[PDB]
């Protein structure tokens, strides 16, 4: 109803870093997802296999998490 289906992505500081960039240009969205695809495909696949609600955390800026040891 408005939560993060991808808890694993909250463990991704890279996703938070890139998050700001996608909000600037959603055109580079697949390009950023591309890099992680070779880093950990099983992880990027989870994003697509979970509830579409994930887009919320995708379009919302990083002010929460930023990897273990960092916050938004």
UniProtKB/Swiss-Prot annotation:
Similarity comment: family membership: Belongs to the RAD23 family.
Protein's name in the database: UV excision repair protein RAD23 homolog B
Subcellular localization: Nucleus; Cytoplasm
Highest taxon of source: Eukaryota
Subunit-level organization: Component of the XPC complex composed of XPC, RAD23B and CETN2. Interacts with NGLY1 and PSMC1. Interacts with ATXN3. Interacts with PSMD4 and PSMC5. Interacts with AMFR. Interacts with VCP; the interaction is indirect and mediated by NGLY1.
UniProt domain STI1: residue ranges: 4-47
Disulfide bonds: none
Section covered of the full-length record: 271 to 342 of 409
Domain comment as written in the entry: The ubiquitin-like domain mediates interaction with ATXN3.
Signal peptide (from-to): none
Functional note: Multiubiquitin chain receptor involved in modulation of proteasomal degradation. Binds to polyubiquitin chains. Proposed to be capable to bind simultaneously to the 26S proteasome and to polyubiquitinated substrates and to deliver ubiquitinated proteins to the proteasome. May play a role in endoplasmic reticulum-associated degradation (ERAD) of misfolded glycoproteins by association with PNGase and delivering deglycosylated proteins to the proteasome.
Originating gene: RAD23B
């Amino acid at each position: 109803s408005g939560g993060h289906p991808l808890e694993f992505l909250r463990n991704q500081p890279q996703f938070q870093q890139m998050r700001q960039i996608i909000q600037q240009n959603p055109s580079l969205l697949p390009a950023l997802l591309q890099q992680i695809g070779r880093e950990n495909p099983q992880l990027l696949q989870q994003i697509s296999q979970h509830q579409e609600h994930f887009i919320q955390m995708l379009n919302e800026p990083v002010q929460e998490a930023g990897g273990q040891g960092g916050g938004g």
